[PDB]
Amino acid sequence: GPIRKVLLLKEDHEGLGISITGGKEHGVPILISEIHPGQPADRCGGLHVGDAILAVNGVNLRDTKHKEAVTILSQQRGEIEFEVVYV
C-alpha cells in the first residue's frame, strides 16, 4: 500500500502498545503483529496489524534485526513519528 506517516503520543509510564515480529535476520521487515487495546498505538488510530515499520523519528528500520528494532522503538518518547506501510 501507500507509505504513511503516523503520529503517536505516549506518556513515559507506558509502552507503545504493539507487538512486533520479523526483522532482517528473518528476511522480512519489522511487522506489527498486534495492536493492544487502549494503549498508545491503538489510541493514535493510524497503526495496524500487518503494517511494516519503515522508520521511527527518522531512524530507518528497514534493515534492522529484531532486537535492534526493539531497542530503537523502546527508546522513543513523547510525540513519536512512524513511517509505515501495509503490504
Partner: peptide, 7 residues
Amino acid sequence: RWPTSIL
C-alpha cells in the same frame, strides 16, 4: 518461526 516482542 519468527520471534515476537511486546513493546
